[PDB]
């Protein structure tokens, strides 16, 4: 921090403009590097210049001064009397993790990476104390923009700080499941939701459930219809059904509708494949926090699932000409068939929502690596024995075309039926390569998946409320608003209520610290030392 | 059955009725000590299949579609292509090897083993708990085979016109007093041994 502060001090040029001989330290200099460490999303903590004068929350700044230079014992003492102690405890971990990766050391770089994991547990243990005194008031402090930490919430800090043990607490997951549904009750199930989405006249009867019974007892027919399209799970179901119906239609035209005059679904496949990319405009274009366009492109490229989604168009690249000239039957069927295969592979992403198979797809995406080489372990010897099959036949013959079909048939017969090597030697190689990396993943996959849930939840919250087949009505309507963030995950509370909330948090923090010290003095090692 | 002309639509109803009969027959192993808990865990295994079917059949049918797409591009035969695609899919299922044995098999095995792990302790307790309901039911059942049980079904009416002592009975008070005194003595012994043995914990000794 001292080195980087010196660098920003010397690099600012209209600060020495008054007196270049002597560099003068100011308040904004620490604020700029602090923003650089903590993140772009926050405004500068200390305002730019433009007796005794305290700043708001005169303890947060001393806490930063204690945390940054890795002062363990001072850090806990100063944090014991902080105003808000979930946001501060998470920012203290974010700063430490950011500044503990580019230090060029092995002693303090390891000490700070462990102190961050301790402020992590401080933040977790303070919040479960609030989540056990109340239920609804334990989330209004989970999502409230803090004026003393860069105008950011207590959830976006944890999500962006790679806090793997906080976003998978259960009190965080209940709040995420609640917004996954919306204003309607969660104790309904998925089968009922599918039954109601399949049958349009199935929501006005007593089938679906609701919470906030003011709308359940006195049910408004107009509001009931709008609530489902407001809900994001309905949007997800409409998207999955639309994409599957599209894929079936593409299969249909692959089968029988393949006319030189564009079949009634040629323009349809073009437009409904544009249906995927037109939303990609929204995902890629949107920057809730100030981020660079090239950073956005790099983030898009870093995603292998997005790479497959792009590869759909990448295998379009060879398909449009094949459609334009339909004479290339023999070369051209394979391009569209493999495009179908890649479409089906992209369809496999749907299980991230499935709680029981979401982490399961997560582990399979790391299972995919072993196949690339087990193929070279299997196919090479299968083809080798197929070669010996033709070698048995006759020794010398000159038929390039005929021997190709013969060897293909022999290899197919061997694959269909060899037993000495397939079931006995190869099977346990496969099973072992599986089970080695199967073992010891039980603990971490749950945390990883519960972390990855939020991105999809926020994406579908930001998605429009229309089915992909019809979503053009809003795609042509979201232009007039621009010509002339949401309150669900980030909102401003009223100050009078926020004061009471902060006092409640202070009381619960005091209780948690008191219980923590009382319970840690009772360790057997501590008793022996006593 | 009432109108037997509906051969083609109607065989499937009775055949699937047979399949459901066979599925109901699977409940018999709850008595089997070695496979009772095993059926118990399988009844929770049943969930993964509902979606592994969408993981398997969709791509099998997709590659069957590509099989017909290879054939010829443009043709108009709704009836013929149905039989052709069915035959191609059946051949693919019987024989594809790149995705069946390698990619899907470990997905299946893993979805299995994840919920296989850590159930060794609780399945025994669950099954030994569920045994009693069947035991009491068959205790309350009549003593005749189902083919002939009508003799008692037509005989259990006169008793009504004009709980069992095996699992719930009244004892004689004089004997019950001795039983309660024996219980009191054994409770005193148990409490005494329990406190004597708990004072010997190493943590308790360090605290002492």
Q: DSSP string of A177-232?
A: HHHHH-SS-STT-SHHHHHHHHSSS-SSSS-S--SSTTTTTS--HHHHHHHHHHSH
In the numeric block, which tokens belong to residue A273? Answer: 């494949």
For residue A146, what are the β-bridge partners?
A152
What residues of chain B lie within 8 A of the CB of A337, using their CB? 66, 69-70
* A369 in contact with B, Cβ within 8 Å: no
Q: What is the DSSP letter of A254?
A: H
Interface test with B, best of A357, A412, A434 (most B CBs within 10 A): A357
Question: In this complex, which of B58, B69, B207 lies closest to A337 when CB atoms are compared?
Answer: B69
Which of B44, B46, B59, B69 is the best mutation test for A, with the most CBs of A within 10 A? B69
**Selection from A164, A192, A197, A186 nearest residue A453 by Cα:** A164
Residue B185 CA from chain centroid, whole number: 44
Interface check B97 vs A, CB under 8 A: yes
Residue B208's alpha-carbon distances to A253, A520, B191, B202, in angstroms, are 84, 19, 21, 10
d(CA A297, CA A284): 8
- Cα nearest neighbour of A362 on chain B: B107
| Residue A514 annotated as lining a ligand binding site | no
Strand partners, A78: none
- A153/A490 Cα distance (integer angstroms): 7
Does the distance separating the beta carbons of A251 and B62 come in below 8 Å?
yes
Q: Which residues of A touch B102 (CB under 8 A)?
A: 371, 374-375, 378, 430
How many Å apart are CA A260 and CA A258, to the nearest integer? 7
Residue A277: CB atoms within 10 Å: 13
Query: Testing the interface with A: which of B73, B79, B98 to mutate, by most A Cβ within 10 A?
Result: B73
Q: Does B119 touch chain A (CB under 8 A)?
A: no
Question: Which one of A243, A256, A426 makes the best mutation probe of the B interface by having the most chain B beta carbons within 10 Å?
Answer: A256
Q: Is A434–B109 a contact, with Cβ atoms under 8 angstroms apart?
A: yes
d(CA A24, CA A433): 62
- CA A107/CA A115 separation, integer angstroms: 12
Q: Which residues contact A202 (CB under 8 A, 6 or more apart)?
A: A195, A196, A208
Instruction: Name the binding residues of B.
Output: 137
Q: Which residues of B touch A365 (CB under 8 A)?
A: none
Query: With 0-12 CB in 10 A as exposed, 13-18 as middle and 19+ as buried, what is A461?
Result: middle
CA–CA gap between residue A449 and residue A47 (Å, rounded): 39
* Chain A residues with CB-CB distance to B70 below 8 A: 333-334, 337
Block residue for tokens 């010509």: A483
Q: How big is the CA angle at A24 (ends A18 and A27), to the nearest 5 degrees?
A: 110
Q: Which of A525, A511, A518 shows the shortest CA–CA distance to A80?
A: A511
CA distance B45 to B32: 19
Contact A430 B55 (CB under 8 A): no
- A130, A87 Cβ separation under 8 angstroms: no
With beta carbons under 8 A apart, name residues in chain A contacting B111. 357, 360
Query: Is there a contact between A254 and B48 if contact means CB atoms under 8 Å apart?
Result: no
Q: How many CA atoms lie within 13 A of A22 on its CB side?
A: 3
Nearest C-alpha of chain A: how many angstroms from B198?
17
Q: Quote the tokens at residue A491.
A: 């909102």
Among B12, B10, B29, smallest CA distance to B20 is for B12
| A360–chain B Cβ distance below 8 A for any pair | yes
Inspect the interface and report whether the beta carbons of B73 and A329 lie closer than 8 Å.
yes
Across the interface, which of B69, B109, B117 has its CB nearest the CB of A333? B69
| B112 and A CB contact within 8 Å | no
- Reported as half-sphere exposure (CB side, CA atoms, 13 A), residue B79 has a value of 0
Q: Which residues pair with A453 in a beta bridge?
A: none
CA distance B89 to B91: 5
B27: tokens are 């409940």
> First vs last Cα of chain A: how many Å apart?
39
Q: Answer yes or no: are the C-beta atoms of A148 and A498 closer than 8 Å.
A: no
Binding-face residues of B in 6-35 toward A, CB within 8 A: none
Taking the C-alpha atoms of residue A156 and residue A453, their distance in angstroms, rounded to an integer, is 14
Q: Which residues, 6 or more positions from A349, have their beta carbon under 8 angstroms from its beta carbon? A: A305, A361
Residue A166 in contact with residue A90, Cβ under 8 Å? yes
To the nearest 10 degrees (0 to 180), the angle between helices A427-438 and B105-116 is 50
Only one residue has tokens 């503990």, namely: A100
**Partners of residue A254 in chain B, C-beta under 8 Å:** 65-66, 69
Is some CB atom of chain B closer than 8 A to the CB atom of A364?
A: yes
Give Cα separations from A322 to A235, A297, A319 (angstroms): 35, 30, 5
Q: What is the Cα A280 distance to its own chain's centre?
A: 16
Angle of helix A232-255 versus helix A442-462 axis, rounded to 10: 90
At A152, phi and psi to the nearest 5? Answer: -130, 160
From the number of C-beta atoms within 10 Å of its C-beta (0-12, 13-18, 19+), residue B94 rates as: exposed
* B55: closest CA of chain A, how far (Å): 8
Question: Which has the closest alpha carbon to B141: B128, B127, B156?
Answer: B156
Contacts with A527 from chain B: Cβ below 8 Å: 206-207
Burial A91-129, CB ≥16 within 10 A → b, else e: bbbbbbbbbbeeeeeeeeeeebeebbebbbebbbebbeb
Tokens of A191: 């089968």
Q: How far apart are CA A271 and CA A500, in angstroms?
A: 54
C-alpha span between A118 and A105 (Å, rounded): 20
- A529 carries a ligand binding annotation: no
Shortest CB distance from B75 goes to which of A256, A367, A527? A256
d(CA A462, CA A232): 9
Residue A280's nearest CA partner among A302, A311, A256, A309 is: A309
Q: What are phi and psi of A146, to 5 degrees?
A: -100, 125
What radius of gyration do chain A's Cα atoms show? 30
User: Per DSSP, what are the bridge partners of residue A152?
Assistant: A146
């Amino acid at each position: 921090f001292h080195s980087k502060l010196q660098k920003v001090l010397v690099e600012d040029p209209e600060r020495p403009a008054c007196a270049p001989a002597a560099p003068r330290l100011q308040m904004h200099h620490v604020a700029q590097v602090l923003r650089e460490l903590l993140g772009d999303f926050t405004q500068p903590l200390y305002p730019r210049p433009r007796h005794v004068t305290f700043t708001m929350d005169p303890i947060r700044d001393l806490l930063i001064w204690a945390i940054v230079q890795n002062r363990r014992e001072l850090a806990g003492i100063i944090w014991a009397q902080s105003q808000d102690c979930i946001a501060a405890a998470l920012a203290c971990s974010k700063i430490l993790k950011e500044l503990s990766k580019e230090e060029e050391d092995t002693d303090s770089s390891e000490e700070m990476l462990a102190l961050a994991e301790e402020y992590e547990h401080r933040a977790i243990g303070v919040f479960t104390e609030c989540y056990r005194k109340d239920e609804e008031r334990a989330q209004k402090l989970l999502t409230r923009v803090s004026e003393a930490w860069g105008k950011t919430t207590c959830l976006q800090l944890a999500l962006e700080a790679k806090d793997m043990k906080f976003v998978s607490h259960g009190g965080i997951q209940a709040f995420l499941t609640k917004v996954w549904w919306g204003q309607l009750s969660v104790d309904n199930g998925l089968w009922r939701v599918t039954l109601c989405m399949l049958a349009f006249p199935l929501l006005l009867t007593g089938l679906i459930s609701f919470r906030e019974k003011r709308l359940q007892d006195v049910g408004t027919p107009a509001a009931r219809a709008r609530a489902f399209f407001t809900a994001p799970v309905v949007v997800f179901h409409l998207n999955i059904l639309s994409y599957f119906a599209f894929l079936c239609l593409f299969a249909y035209v692959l089968m029988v509708d393949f006319q030189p005059v564009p079949s009634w679904c040629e323009c349809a496949i073009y437009l409904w494949l544009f249906s995927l990319v037109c939303e990609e405009m929204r995902q890629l274009f949107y920057d809730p926090d100030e981020c660079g366009l090239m950073k956005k492109a790099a983030l898009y490229f870093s995603d292998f699932w997005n790479k497959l989604d792009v590869g759909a168009i990448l295998l379009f690249v060879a398909g449009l000409t094949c459609r334009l000239i339909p004479a290339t039957l023999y070369p051209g069927r394979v391009i569209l068939s493999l495009d179908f295969i890649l479409f089906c592979l992209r369809l496999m992403h749907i299980f991230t929502i499935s709680k029981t198979l979401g982490p399961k797809i997560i582990i399979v995406k790391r299972m995919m690596k072993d196949v690339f080489f087990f193929l070279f372990l299997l196919a090479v010897w299968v083809v080798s024995f197929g070669v010996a099959k033709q070698a048995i036949l006759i020794h010398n013959e000159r038929r390039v075309d005929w021997l190709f079909r013969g060897a293909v048939y022999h290899s197919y017969l061997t694959i269909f039926g060899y037993l000495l090597f397939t079931n006995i030697l190869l099977l346990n190689l496969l099973i072992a390569m599986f089970n080695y990396t199967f073992q010891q993943v039980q603990e971490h996959t749950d945390q990883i998946w519960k972390f990855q849930r939020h991105d999809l939840i926020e994406e579908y919250h930001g998605r429009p409320a229309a089915p992909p087949p019809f979503i053009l009505l809003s795609h042509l309507q979201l232009f007039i608003k621009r010509v002339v963030r949401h309150k669900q995950l980030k909102n401003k509370l009223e100050k009078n209520e926020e004061a009471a909330l902060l006092s409640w948090e202070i009381y619960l923090k005091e209780n948690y610290l008191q219980n923590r010290q009382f319970q840690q003095k009772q360790r057997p090692e501590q008793k022996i030392e006593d």
